[PDB]
Design an enzyme around this catalytic site. Structure first.
Site, PDB file in Angstrom:
ATOM      1  N   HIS A 196     -65.897 122.805  11.758  1.00  0.00           N
ATOM      2  CA  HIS A 196     -67.462 122.022  12.678  1.00  0.00           C
ATOM      3  C   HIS A 196     -68.513 121.678  11.018  1.00  0.00           C
ATOM      4  CE1 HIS A 196     -70.470 120.866  15.312  1.00  0.00           C
ATOM      5  NE2 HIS A 196     -71.649 121.318  14.701  1.00  0.00           N
ATOM      6  N   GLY A 197     -68.255 120.766  10.770  1.00  0.00           N
ATOM      7  CA  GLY A 197     -69.347 120.600   9.203  1.00  0.00           C
ATOM      8  C   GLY A 197     -70.707 120.512  10.323  1.00  0.00           C
ATOM      9  N   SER A 198     -71.868 120.712   8.795  1.00  0.00           N
ATOM     10  CA  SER A 198     -73.423 121.005   9.588  1.00  0.00           C
ATOM     11  C   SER A 198     -73.963 121.058   8.041  1.00  0.00           C
ATOM     12  CB  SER A 198     -73.902 121.615  10.368  1.00  0.00           C
ATOM     13  OG  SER A 198     -74.389 121.461  11.433  1.00  0.00           O
ATOM     14  N   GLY A 205     -79.668 128.311  13.031  1.00  0.00           N
ATOM     15  CA  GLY A 205     -79.069 128.103  14.797  1.00  0.00           C
ATOM     16  C   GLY A 205     -77.964 128.511  15.326  1.00  0.00           C
ATOM     17  N   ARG A 212     -74.294 124.306  21.496  1.00  0.00           N
ATOM     18  CA  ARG A 212     -75.326 124.261  22.064  1.00  0.00           C
ATOM     19  C   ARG A 212     -74.866 122.615  21.984  1.00  0.00           C
ATOM     20  NH1 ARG A 212     -79.401 125.225  18.706  1.00  0.00           N
ATOM     21  NH2 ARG A 212     -77.757 125.809  17.286  1.00  0.00           N
ATOM     22  N   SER A 238     -65.311 116.405   9.044  1.00  0.00           N
ATOM     23  CA  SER A 238     -66.323 117.692   8.427  1.00  0.00           C
ATOM     24  C   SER A 238     -67.663 117.423   8.278  1.00  0.00           C
ATOM     25  CB  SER A 238     -65.633 118.689   9.871  1.00  0.00           C
ATOM     26  OG  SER A 238     -65.533 119.074  10.954  1.00  0.00           O
ATOM     27  N   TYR A 241     -70.147 115.407   7.415  1.00  0.00           N
ATOM     28  CA  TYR A 241     -71.867 115.888   8.718  1.00  0.00           C
ATOM     29  C   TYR A 241     -72.112 117.219   7.205  1.00  0.00           C
ATOM     30  CZ  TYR A 241     -69.455 113.061  12.236  1.00  0.00           C
ATOM     31  OH  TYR A 241     -68.803 112.199  12.898  1.00  0.00           O
ATOM     32  N   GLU A 322     -61.173 112.757  16.377  1.00  0.00           N
ATOM     33  CA  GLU A 322     -62.262 114.346  17.333  1.00  0.00           C
ATOM     34  C   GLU A 322     -61.695 114.392  18.740  1.00  0.00           C
ATOM     35  OE1 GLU A 322     -65.849 111.896  17.386  1.00  0.00           O
ATOM     36  OE2 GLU A 322     -65.354 111.371  15.632  1.00  0.00           O
TER      37      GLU A 322
HETATM   38  O1  LIG Z   1     -67.702 118.470  12.808  1.00  0.00           O
HETATM   39  C1  LIG Z   1     -68.476 117.913  12.733  1.00  0.00           C
HETATM   40  N1  LIG Z   1     -69.536 117.882  12.770  1.00  0.00           N
HETATM   41  C2  LIG Z   1     -70.756 117.753  12.928  1.00  0.00           C
HETATM   42  S1  LIG Z   1     -72.419 117.906  13.454  1.00  0.00           S
HETATM   43  C3  LIG Z   1     -73.204 116.208  14.727  1.00  0.00           C
HETATM   44  C4  LIG Z   1     -75.302 116.952  14.179  1.00  0.00           C
HETATM   45  N2  LIG Z   1     -75.188 118.495  15.125  1.00  0.00           N
HETATM   46  C5  LIG Z   1     -76.503 118.372  14.972  1.00  0.00           C
HETATM   47  C6  LIG Z   1     -77.108 119.658  15.531  1.00  0.00           C
HETATM   48  N3  LIG Z   1     -76.338 119.728  17.065  1.00  0.00           N
HETATM   49  C7  LIG Z   1     -77.426 120.236  17.729  1.00  0.00           C
HETATM   50  C8  LIG Z   1     -76.236 120.742  19.175  1.00  0.00           C
HETATM   51  C9  LIG Z   1     -77.050 121.359  20.278  1.00  0.00           C
HETATM   52  C10 LIG Z   1     -78.185 121.701  20.656  1.00  0.00           C
HETATM   53  C11 LIG Z   1     -79.564 121.597  18.333  1.00  0.00           C
HETATM   54  N4  LIG Z   1     -78.389 120.853  17.767  1.00  0.00           N
HETATM   55  C12 LIG Z   1     -75.219 119.263  17.006  1.00  0.00           C
HETATM   56  C13 LIG Z   1     -74.703 117.800  16.292  1.00  0.00           C
HETATM   57  N5  LIG Z   1     -70.613 116.338  13.794  1.00  0.00           N
HETATM   58  C14 LIG Z   1     -68.964 115.797  14.229  1.00  0.00           C
HETATM   59  C15 LIG Z   1     -68.656 114.682  15.015  1.00  0.00           C
HETATM   60  C16 LIG Z   1     -67.161 114.634  14.707  1.00  0.00           C
HETATM   61  C17 LIG Z   1     -67.023 115.285  14.492  1.00  0.00           C
HETATM   62  C18 LIG Z   1     -66.499 116.077  13.700  1.00  0.00           C
HETATM   63  C19 LIG Z   1     -68.481 117.330  13.636  1.00  0.00           C
END
Ligand SMILES: O=c1[nH]c(SCCN2CCN(c3ccccn3)CC2)nc2ccccc12
Ligand code: NI
Ligand code: NI
Ligand code: NI
Ligand code: NI
Length: 345
Positions: A196-198, A205, A212, A238, A241, A322
């Site tokens: 999970h990348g971010s 958080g 979440r 990932s 992101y 995914e």
């Molecule tokens: O690896 C992967 N990473 C991410 S991150 C997508 C953006 N994030 C922002 C933060 N967010 C929340 C959630 C709940 C409450 C507060 N924020 C969750 C979403 N998407 C992906 C999508 C597809 C495949 C891998 C990935």
């Protein structure tokens, strides 16, 4: 300072509590910091902005255009002021673009609020304890590091044209109570270690509150596969992101054990609100998948660290696999990686 944490852990703390990083993330989304600085950001405001996008969802659902919307957009941009050099909320899937911003603002609010919360300890250690997470440096000569490094090297070659990757630090993470919240799902079959990348501004958080779901007021149509937690089996997916750049080349990606069970397999976007029964997750089928010949199983948990090969799946819009679960208890975070991106351009 007077920190007693290992140096890589101190650097991670300074990275994820960087207020300048939070402001740049908001500027990246063209939010006006003058009319709404980082201090004014509040959860009730993000909550109301989510609900405004949910009104656009209903409006688009019932079939209206251009005079319901401009009012709905004027409401949105009044609540969250922007600084453009005002796009339409009902076209170009702008509901998804704005809903991702609110997702990141929720994490940035949590980071800033935690940061503003005795002489004994260096603030680095004080902020570290606010995460309520145990972070230890994984020895680079360990079995864990070799598995994780191989997972990285095997699943990023297909994006070499865009960037290359180098693992800087590997941390083992243990969120307080997460091993307990996840215990029921360790009986479920089909558990995998996924990425999970971010952005770095999200991990204060992510560590304190875990991964979440978007709140109930969030528009289900703002998420390609519904309001869930998204994972990939290849870092090439990932790593996108992290939103790293040549001027911000250090990103963070976590490894988490995800209980998938029976997977609802799809080949295109579906704003899922509820799963069919018997199904515990969604798997978006991509054109590229790790070679199943190299899959290793670990405590009953699969690690698909094979080299990226073609899956043979025709009729799919996804380039990579995914994985989405819709229960936060289905995720147990295990590792956090610090990666340096080397861009070609
Ligand atoms: O690896 C992967 N990473 C991410 S991150 C997508 C953006 N994030 C922002 C933060 N967010 C929340 C959630 C709940 C409450 C507060 N924020 C969750 C979403 N998407 C992906 C999508 C597809 C495949 C891998 C990935
Ligand atoms: Ni490489
Ligand atoms: Ni849609
Ligand atoms: Ni992006
Ligand atoms: Ni469909």
């Amino acid at each position: 300072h007077m920190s007693k944490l290992p140096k890589p852990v101190q650097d991670l703390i300074k990275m994820i509590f960087d207020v300048e990083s939070m402001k740049k993330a908001m500027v990246e989304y063209e939010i006006d910091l003058q009319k709404m600085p980082l201090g004014k950001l509040s959860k009730r405001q993000i909550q109301a902005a989510y609900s405004i996008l949910s009104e656009v969802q209903q409006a688009v659902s019932q079939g209206s255009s251009d005079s319901q919307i401009l009012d709905l957009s004027n409401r949105f941009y009044t609540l969250i002021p922007h600084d453009f050099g005002p796009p339409l909320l009902n076209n170009a899937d702008s509901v998804q673009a704005k809903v991702e911003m609110l997702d990141n603002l929720l994490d940035i609010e949590v980071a800033y609020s935690l940061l503003r919360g005795d002489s004994s300890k260096d603030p680095i250690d004080v902020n570290y304890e606010k995460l309520k997470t145990d972070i230890k440096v994984v020895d680079r000569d360990s079995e864990e590091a070799e598995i994780i490094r191989k997972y990285v090297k095997n699943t990023h070659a297909t994006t070499h044209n865009a960037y290359d990757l180098e693992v800087i630090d590997i941390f083992k993470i243990e969120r307080e109570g997460e091993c307990q919240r996840y215990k029921p799902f360790k009986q479920l079959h089909n558990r995998r270690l996924l990425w999970h990348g971010s952005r770095t501004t999200n991990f204060a958080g992510i560590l304190s509150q875990g991964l979440r779901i978007a709140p109930p007021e969030a528009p289900v149509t703002g998420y390609m596969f519904g309001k869930g937690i998204y994972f990939a089996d290849m870092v090439s997916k990932s790593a996108n992101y992290c939103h790293t750049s040549q001027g911000d080349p250090i990103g963070l990606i976590l490894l988490g054990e995800v209980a998938l069970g029976n997977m609802y397999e799809l080949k295109h976007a579906s704003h899922i609100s509820k799963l069919p029964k018997g199904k515990h997750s969604v798997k978006g089928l991509g054109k590229t998948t790790p070679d199943p010949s190299a899959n290793i199983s670990l405590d009953g948990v699969d690690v698909p660290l094979g080299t990226g090969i073609s899956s043979g799946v025709n009729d799919t819009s996804l380039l990579y696999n995914e994985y989405i679960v819709y229960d936060i208890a289905q995720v147990n975070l295990k590792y956090l990686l610090k990666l340096k991106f080397n861009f070609k351009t």
